[PDB]
Write a protein that binds this ligand. Structure first.
Ligand SMILES: [Zn+2]
Ligand SMILES: [Zn+2]
Ligand SMILES: [Zn+2]
Ligand SMILES: [Zn+2]
Length: 182
């Protein structure tokens, strides 16, 4: 009975290959709003009719992330509500989100960081691993193609290469294992 101990070996690199799905989360809806005839939007009080009358408008829906209400043409409806163009930026990245949108933890986030921060990534440099790239994952967790190496040899381990997984997440060959602790 020759059964090797808790040992492993690098194999064919592969990834989850998903990149999330726009259909999953409710993306921003670019549509023409129907607020082109409410309150005093147009500058000055004129144009057809002459002198009109429109003061405060209570019980009116306010722009998502704003103090007043919407009254423009093109509006982005997302997160079960209408979110302005400039009022739809990532609270963290603060980058222009004029294409997609995301919500989580009572805050509007983007999909970019959702994959890295709220997804899978390298367990070495905390970098965001692509969606379907090509890399080898350590048993359960995933690692980098470059970061991958030995604690002593400091050399990457390609398919076929035998490496051990330390309790503190560390790659160690056979000879390095015993020499390391065992
Ligand atoms: Zn706004
Ligand atoms: Zn973001
Ligand atoms: Zn890394
Ligand atoms: Zn080694």
């Amino acid at each position: 009975s020759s059964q090797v101990p808790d040992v492993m070996v690098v194999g064919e690199p592969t990834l989850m290959g998903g990149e999330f799905g726009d259909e999953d989360e409710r993306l921003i809806t670019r549509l023409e709003n129907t607020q082109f005839d409410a309150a005093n939007g147009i500058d000055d009080e004129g144009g057809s009719g002459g002198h009109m009358g429109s003061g405060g408008t209570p019980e009116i829906p306010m722009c998502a992330g704003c103090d007043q209400h919407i009254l423009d043409r093109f509006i982005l409806k997302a997160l079960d509500r209408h979110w302005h163009s400039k009022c739809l930026k990532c609270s963290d990245c603060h980058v222009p989100l004029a294409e997609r949108c995301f919500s989580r933890g009572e805050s509007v986030y983007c999909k970019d960081d959702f994959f890295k921060r709220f997804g899978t990534k390298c367990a070495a440099c905390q970098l965001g691993i692509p969606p379907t790239q090509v890399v080898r994952r350590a048993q359960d967790f995933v690692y980098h193609l470059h970061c991958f190496a030995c604690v002593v040899c400091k050399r990457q381990l390609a398919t076929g290469d035998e490496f051990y997984l330390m309790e503190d997440s560390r790659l160690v060959c056979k000879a390095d294992y015993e020499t390391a602790k065992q």
